[PDB]
Write a protein that binds this DNA or RNA. Structure first.
Lengths: 85, 205, 666
RNA sequence: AAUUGAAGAGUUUGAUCAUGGCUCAGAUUGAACGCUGGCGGCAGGCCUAACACAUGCAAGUCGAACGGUAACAGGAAGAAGCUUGCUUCUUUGCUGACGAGUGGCGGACGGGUGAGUAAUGUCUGGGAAACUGCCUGAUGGAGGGGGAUAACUACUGGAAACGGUAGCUAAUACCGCAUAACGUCGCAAGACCAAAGAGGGGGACCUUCGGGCCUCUUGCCAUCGGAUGUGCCCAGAUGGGAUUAGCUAGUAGGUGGGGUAACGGCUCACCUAGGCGACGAUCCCUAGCUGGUCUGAGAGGAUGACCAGCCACACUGGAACUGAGACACGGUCCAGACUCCUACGGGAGGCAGCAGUGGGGAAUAUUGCACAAUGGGCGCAAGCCUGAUGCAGCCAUGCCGCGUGUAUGAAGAAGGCCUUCGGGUUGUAAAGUACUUUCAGCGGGGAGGAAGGGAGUAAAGUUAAUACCUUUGCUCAUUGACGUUACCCGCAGAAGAAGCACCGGCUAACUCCGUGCCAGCAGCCGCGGUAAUACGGAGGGUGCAAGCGUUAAUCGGAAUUACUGGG
């Protein structure tokens, strides 16, 4: 609404559209993971876990999923491999 | 919010003189005192503890020329303070600048003393004061301003003041027209025919 | 930086009988006075426009149509006026009115022949009337080139210059000299003009006879110094639709139209009581009149006002003496033909609108907030002429209606509301058909009230013909409060307009002293509901000549009944007669229409009384029944095309033609 | 020294006692209305329709993050307006600056509202599994690359709001790669994550004369704390009804996954069959909670405007986005109700922000001045913004003071009212005569709210350094809206300023005339039907006073819901 910071609007667009992507990409990877576990594929998991980790941690200290989410994630995921791997 | 009307016609009613023609001659008569505060003047006022119990404070109120509002607050004041609550109400009145000016001599009538204070013809400890309400305290130094001094009025004013019982609790001048306020008037001084636990009973019920 | 010489103020009103060109003429003035274009709706009452170093305030609204009142209101405030005339309408019977009601106040005016292009558009024909109808001293100020369809240019005698119009879009004009022929026609009219202007300036008189031509400047001075006195009326012309004669009529404005100074001071009254002029000095007490409230969506309540003395100021405080109220004027405002010019003050003689004020309704006098709390005049007296019965359906609507006038009576005090003191129903005072009519739309629409609209009832009366004498008995003896009263009376009709007369005709005292009061209050009473329809049985004399009583049973009351019985029957017996209301009326009419005027009145159950001439008119007096007298306005104005007016008063009551006796048994 | 304070009357009966209702005298009010109305000071001011809303305002700001020039100021090789120093245009972004655009911070505060909500609430008191911008302490980082894009140019659709192609370009925009612990993951071993530069000033030296370099400030990233904020759990209190007694399927508990900043049926599969409920569930009605507030002697009763804390809501319903923070009061999407614009194809908007309008109502005020003061945002700063706030305007709405004169005046005037016609009374009241002059009026004088900022300097801090920066003094010229300020000084003349109710009893105050159960009064008892202290007028008086009444309403009297304190 006419009030200079209509801009504020467009700002958070660019913004969402960006996080949208990453966030997606990030999930995509963590999904690749439970998939592996969920089947039994010990190593393929570990491998895909290694793949997701850096992307998790990163996207977190980047901001858009701060901290304990990653924790929680890499956490439980980890727990899962050495469950039956 | 001053009374304004026939001063004397009041005293008549209260069955005394309150010194409202205070002015010159005295013990009224030459006025019409007593047996006709109205037209059924003769008529005996037989009456209620209420009627008597009013007439006291109503009268007092008249004496100092106070209006029922300010007065109530005086009473609520008296209440608020420690001490015989009627006594206090009396002091509270006695500290009225206006009171403490007729009581000096500067003013012929209280009703006039005040006439002066309104017109800033008066000072305490060096400040012109001009609200009658002004409560004076021990060690204050009320006086006439130099400008408009030893004038018309104030002359006979200070004058007949001497013939008055003359207070105690204030040292006054005449050359100066300056005046100490020395202490707060005891139930003992000023009084007799004035009955406080009445004008307390009043505001008490 | 004065920008206000006062002597540059033109406050004008466009009046004239409907059809005309009033409205259209104005929008036009508001295009020239402000087309500007320099290398850089009558939207609210009065509007300002500039025309060659001169500010003009216009209030087009007249209309004439029955209800004028408004026209005659702006008229008082403003100083000048153009009485537009419809050139075409030649056998014009209504060109009139408008004016005969102008000098009625005392204000100067010029004339304009608008449709100089429409068929029958004969300039002269107007003047052949402007002295034949109202009869003033107009002055031909122009001569048109090409009568009607051949409307080209025009000529101004006074300045012997010729202008032209190549179109009607108002663009291709020009001041092209006289076209071959014509010319001659001029002179003479330009001589008479100067010959006319002679009756004002002796200077323009000698120079006339000597052979010298008055200066184009001293010549104007005559005409102007002559109009302003209500002696002459400068006639101009031009198709206002085709944009012709407008820019020239505008000059006609300033050149001859009075300035807030050339006009006679307003009288007002001090709080003590004494007349007094109000001087147009923008530095004397502040004295302003109000005249039109309007609700603005953007700034709210607006109160257009005409200042006379002192000067109102933006962000000050005023005081309305009329309703002893301290108004706080916060913002001043001037209506420009297309925007809201927010100015800072209105100096005496100037007009505009203030914003703020709440208690300031019409005709209010606002002075300084200390000035002599004075009250101007304003007193206008346009009463009504036509009313109607308005019964608000179920008691429900009877309310929506109360509010109806509770706001409508402030937005137009040109009417009156009254509850018929005899039969609930309320009257709606108007000033002509249309008037009440269009209220009936708003009062029924913008108020959603849906009641009835028929006609008033008539305050009938009962009485008798033959005198009678019957017994009044009561007695009820069973065992105690006996109730014993009885009387005999003498009932006798009295002249239609006699009243009420009883007769204490008791000899020794067969009817005790103490009971007569009550036997009267009984008779007096009973007379309430007539024997026929139930109306005030009146016009009779009663005689109590007998009746007995009982020592114990009688009662003050028992007698009030017996007597209320003797009467309740003497009227039933003495052959009753349904009396009705007769009015006194006086129709002012030109004996031209008179002929039928009287007729119509005869065929209205009325009987004529006379006609002692008045002015150029003639008055007719006579009586009539209020029943056969309804909506007379729109019937009188019919037999007179407008030149007719009447009054009305009550007189007496009188029998109904029998055929109307059994008629009323309703 | 600091809650030390408690009153009754009238009316059932012919009379009495008792019981028992009803009624009054008190305080109080966001009041309204009627009559009347002088000044000020301080407070208050839509209680109804969380009804609808014209217009203007209510949130911006930084050029010391960036590409920049469109505006207005200036200058400029060089061209000139020349009237041979005064200076005008081509340009030129050259710097002072600044529209538009990117970026950053703020738009989650401030201000409004009481609609929802009888418990995602409030108050009181404990708790643990949490995150927290800007401020803050500690320690490290601050390496090296890249591809974009808006602005803009071309072309283009639109009536408009707003787009459409293709270019081109910058950074504190974005993304990699490096680096990686006291961080996270993991018992470990291992594994893994970040970032931004920008200004000021500087001798030598010098170079692609823009700077490298030196230094200073300010910023960028990281983990640990501080502080503030926030989420969260728990028990207790937190209105009415039983003419509502049974309630409940994510329902209560488990486990396992998933989820969030975090604990948690928060979500799910699975198992269990539980869980709430006369200590009142559920259902229905009502309500924001508190501090407080009114009342009362207190215990209670009543309440929750203004001020301050919490909550809730932002036309209605729904929802996420961005973010440190919202599921956003001038944000986004949908749905709904509704209004506006439109060239008819399509578009825009939400005053419970300030002022104002309509509507409703007994009722509630100006479309004001100002950022000078405190305070908030952005900024290094100066500044800019701020309907927060400070003020003014409107209304006797309240509270508080003041005035409307002060003396003096008598056989006591006249007039009026009563009168047993002696007089009485109005009444020191008037008038007469002195004396005063605050407050309104006039005219002069004239505080405080003003702290700081701005330059000049003096140092002391650092540093290569006396440049610059921080503090400190020093000096100089300055910054109020209010504002004809408060306060004071004079000028004149009593001059401009009194009204409302009551007077039978309760209840302070009485007679005459008018009226004749009429007209009327009336809080109760009851007046009025020919001598009316009760009706209405007058004289008189009583009470209050710029107010007085009247209505409305809470408590009191009511020991009349009785815990205190009854039957």
């Amino acid at each position: 609404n006419i009030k200079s910071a209509k801009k504020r609007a467009i700002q958070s667009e660019k913004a969402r559209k960006h996080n949208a992507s990453r966030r997606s990409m990030m999930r995509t990877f963590i999904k690749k993971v439970y998939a592996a576990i969920e089947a039994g594929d010990k190593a393929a998991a570990q491998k895909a876990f290694n793949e997701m980790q850096p992307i998790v941690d990163r996207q977190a200290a980047k901001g858009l999923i701060h901290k304990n989410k990653a924790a929680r994630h890499k956490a439980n995921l980890t727990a899962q491999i050495n469950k039956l791997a | 919010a001053r009374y304004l009307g026939p001063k004397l016609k009041l005293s008549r009613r209260e069955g005394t003189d309150l010194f409202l023609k205070s002015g010159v001659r005295a013990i009224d008569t030459k006025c019409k005192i007593e047996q006709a505060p109205g037209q059924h003047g003769a008529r005996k006022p037989r009456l209620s503890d209420y009627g008597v119990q009013l007439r006291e404070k109503q009268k007092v109120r008249r004496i100092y020329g106070v209006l029922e509002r300010q007065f109530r607050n005086y009473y609520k004041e008296a209440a608020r303070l420690k001490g015989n609550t009627g006594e206090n109400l009396l002091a509270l009145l006695e500290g009225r600048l206006d009171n403490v000016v007729y009581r000096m001599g500067f003013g012929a009538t209280r009703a006039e003393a005040r006439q002066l204070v309104s017109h800033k013809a008066i000072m305490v400890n060096g400040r012109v004061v001009n609200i009658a309400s002004y409560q004076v305290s021990p060690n204050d130094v009320v006086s006439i301003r130099e400008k408009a001094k030893k004038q018309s009025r104030v002359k006979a004013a200070l004058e007949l003041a001497e013939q008055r019982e003359k207070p105690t609790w204030l040292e006054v001048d005449a050359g100066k027209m300056e005046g100490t306020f020395k202490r707060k008037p005891e139930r003992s001084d000023l009084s007799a025919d004035i009955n406080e636990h009445l004008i307390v009973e009043l505001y008490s019920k | 930086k004065v920008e206000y010489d006062l002597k540059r103020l033109r406050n004008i009103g466009i009046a004239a009988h409907i059809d005309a060109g009033k409205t259209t003429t104005t929008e036009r003035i508001l295009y020239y006075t402000g087309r500007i274009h320099k290398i850089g709706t009558i939207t609210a009452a009065v509007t300002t426009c500039f025309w060659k170093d001169h500010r003009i305030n216009i209030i087009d609204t007249p209309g004439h149509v029955d209800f004028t009142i408004e026209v005659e209101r702006s008229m008082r405030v403003l100083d000048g006026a153009i009485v537009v005339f419809d050139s075409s309408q030649g056998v014009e019977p209504q060109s009139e009115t408008v004016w005969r009601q102008a000098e009625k106040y005392k204000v100067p005016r010029i004339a304009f022949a608008n449709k100089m292009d429409k068929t029958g558009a004969d300039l002269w024909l107007v003047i052949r009337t402007m002295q034949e109808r109202l009869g003033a001293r107009p002055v031909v100020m122009q001569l048109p080139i090409g009568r009607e369809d051949t409307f080209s240019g025009i000529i101004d005698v006074l300045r012997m210059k010729a202008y032209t119009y190549g179109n009607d879009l108002g663009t291709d004009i020009r001041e092209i000299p006289i076209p071959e022929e014509y010319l001659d026609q001029a002179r003479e009219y330009h001589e008479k003009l100067v010959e006319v202007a002679a009756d004002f300036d002796e200077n323009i008189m000698l120079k006339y006879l000597e052979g010298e031509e008055p200066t184009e400047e001293e010549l104007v001075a005559a005409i102007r110094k002559g109009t302003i006195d209500l002696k002459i009326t400068p006639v101009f012309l031009g198709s206002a639709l085709k944009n012709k004669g407008v820019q020239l009529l505008l000059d006609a404005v300033v050149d001859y139209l009075p300035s807030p100074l050339d006009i006679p001071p307003i009288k007002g009254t001090t709080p003590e009581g004494e007349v007094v002029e109000i001087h147009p000095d923008p530095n004397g007490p502040l004295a302003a009149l109000a005249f039109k409230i309007m609700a603005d969506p953007y700034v709210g309540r607006l109160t257009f006002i005409r200042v006379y003395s002192g000067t109102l100021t933006s962000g000050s405080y005023v005081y309305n003496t009329t309703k002893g109220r301290k108004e706080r004027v916060a913002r001043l405002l001037r209506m420009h033909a297309n925007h809201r010019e927010e100015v800072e003050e209105l100096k005496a003689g100037d007009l505009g609108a203030v914003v703020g004020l709440k208690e300031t309704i019409t005709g209010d006098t606002l002075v300084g907030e200390d000035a002599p709390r004075v009250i101007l005049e304003s007193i206008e007296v346009p009463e009504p002429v036509i009313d109607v019965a308005i019964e608000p359906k179920t008691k429900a609507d009877q309310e929506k209606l109360s509010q109806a006038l509770a706001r409508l009576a402030e937005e137009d005090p040109t009417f009156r509301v009254s509850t018929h003191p005899e039969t609930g129903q309320t009257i709606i005072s108007g000033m002509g058909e249309l008037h009440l009519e269009i209220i009936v739309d708003r009062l029924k629409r913008e108020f959603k009230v849906d009641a009835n609209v028929g006609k008033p009832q008539v305050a009938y009366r009962e009485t008798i013909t033959k005198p009678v004498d019957v017994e009044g008995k009561f007695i009820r003896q069973t065992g105690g409060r006996g109730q014993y009263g009885h009387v005999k009376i003498k009932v006798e009709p009295l002249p239609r307009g006699s009243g009420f007369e009883f007769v204490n005709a008791i000899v020794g005292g067969v009817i005790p002293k103490e009971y007569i009061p009550a036997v009267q209050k009984g008779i007096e009473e009973a007379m309430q509901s007539g024997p026929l329809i139930g109306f005030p049985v009146v016009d009779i004399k009663v005689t109590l000549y007998d009746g007995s009583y009982h020592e114990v049973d009688s009662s003050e009351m028992a007698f009030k009944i017996a007597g209320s019985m003797a009467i309740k029957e003497a009227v039933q017996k003495g052959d009753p007669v349904i009396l009705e209301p007769i009015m006194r009326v006086e129709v002012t009419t030109p004996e031209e229409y008179m002929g039928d005027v009287i007729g119509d009145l005869n065929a209205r159950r009325g009987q004529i009384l006379g006609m002692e001439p008045r002015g150029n008119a003639q008055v007719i007096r006579a009586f009539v029944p209020l029943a056969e007298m309804f909506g007379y306005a729109t019937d009188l104005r019919s037999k007179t095309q407008g030149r007719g007016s009447f009054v009305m008063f009550f007189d007496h009551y009188q029998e109904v033609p029998k055929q109307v006796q059994e008629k009323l048994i309703k």
